[PDB]
Design a protein around this ligand. Sequence first.
Ligand code: GBA
Ligand code: MG
Length: 390
Amino acid sequence: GSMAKAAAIGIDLGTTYSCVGVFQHGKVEIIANDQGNRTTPSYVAFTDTERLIGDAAKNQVALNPQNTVFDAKRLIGRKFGDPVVQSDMKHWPFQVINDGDKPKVQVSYKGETKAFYPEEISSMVLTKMKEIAEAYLGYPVTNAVITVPAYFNDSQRQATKDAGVIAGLNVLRIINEPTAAAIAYGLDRTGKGERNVLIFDLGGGTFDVSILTIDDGIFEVKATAGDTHLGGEDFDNRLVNHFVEEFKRKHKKDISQNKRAVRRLRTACERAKRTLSSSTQASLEIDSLFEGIDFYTSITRARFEELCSDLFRSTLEPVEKALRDAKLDKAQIHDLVLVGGSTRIPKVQKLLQDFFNGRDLNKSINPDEAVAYGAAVQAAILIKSTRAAA
Ligand SMILES: Nc1ncnc2c1nc(Br)n2[C@@H]1O[C@H](CO)[C@@H](O)[C@H]1O
Ligand SMILES: [Mg+2]
C-alpha cells in the first residue's frame, strides 16, 4: 500500500563545527562520522588531486592555509562591502574576492584557480553531513531541517536554503538555533501558560544570548545580545601566551617566531583546556618543542581560571543587556539552557548560576549537540502526514 518513509535529519550548520541527528524510536541519535566524532569541522580543503571535507580538511590546514576554507557562515548572504566582512578578511589566510559586491573565496583546485560563493562552500559541508547520516541509516536521506542564528536576516536565510538545495537536500524549514536548543529540552511541550527561556551560547569565536517566550508551543524571540569577540579561541590564546612566557623563564628562549612550535603549543593548550573541565589539573607534554628542548609542564584549573577571569565575567554583560531589552528581571526567567562546548567550563557555569541565585542549568544534552538534537526533533514532526479518524 504505502512504503516506509526514510527518516528526516536535523543539521546544526555551525561556524566552526557542524552536527547531525535523527529522531527514531522516540529518541534522538546524534550521528558520529567515520572517524568517530559526534561533531565535524565546517572546513573544506582543496588540492591538486582532491577536495577534502571535515576532519580530513582540518587535519591538513597547517601546510595548506591558502586553500583550506573555514568560517563560510560569516560570509553567507552578506555584501563584500559590509564592514563585518572587511574586518574578518584580515584574519583569514584564504583569499576573499569581490564579484558584483558579493564575496567569493578563491583557491587553487585541481590545477586551476577557482572561486566559490559562500553557499557553495556550505553545500559541501551539508553534503558531508548527509553522507554521515546515510552511513548510519543505510539508505539515501532527502529531508532536513537546518538551523541558523536568530539574528540572520532574509538574505542570509535564503542563502542557507540555497546551500541545502545545491547539496541535494529538501529543506523542510530553516529554524533559529536558540529555538532548536529549547525544543531539544521539550520546553514547547509544557502546555498552557507563558514561559521565559534564556539560551546562553558560548562558541569557538562568538557569544550569543537569546531570550525566548513560549506560549502553547509558539516561540517569540524577545531579545538577542552577545559579543562577537568572545569565545573558546580567546581562552586558548591566554594559555598560549602563558606557556610562551613560562618557556622564556625556564629555558631563556623565545619560541613565538617558530610557527610549528606555536601551533604545537596551541594544539596542546586547547586539549589541556578540555581536560581542565573534568580535572583539577592537566599535564602539557611536548617533545622537542624548540631547539630540541622537551616542554613537559602542568597547569591547574585555578591558574587557568585566573588567566581567563576577565573573559568569563564579561559573559554576564550581554545577559544583563538582553534582560533589559526583553524588559524582564532575572527572577522572571523560568529556564536557563547551555549551548556550545565552552559552556562545559565549571567557572562559566558557576558565574551564571550565581548570577541567577543558585538556579539549575539545563546541560544534560551535550551543549555542542543540543541545536542538532532540537533540529532532528522538529524534522520528525514536519514529515508526519496523519489523516484524522472519524
Ligand atoms: N569540554 C570542553 N571544555 C572546554 N572547552 C571545550 C570543551 N569541549 C569543547 Br568543543 N570546547 C571548546 O568549544 C569550542 C567549540 O568551537 C572550542 O574552542 C573547543 O575548545
Ligand atoms: Mg553553534
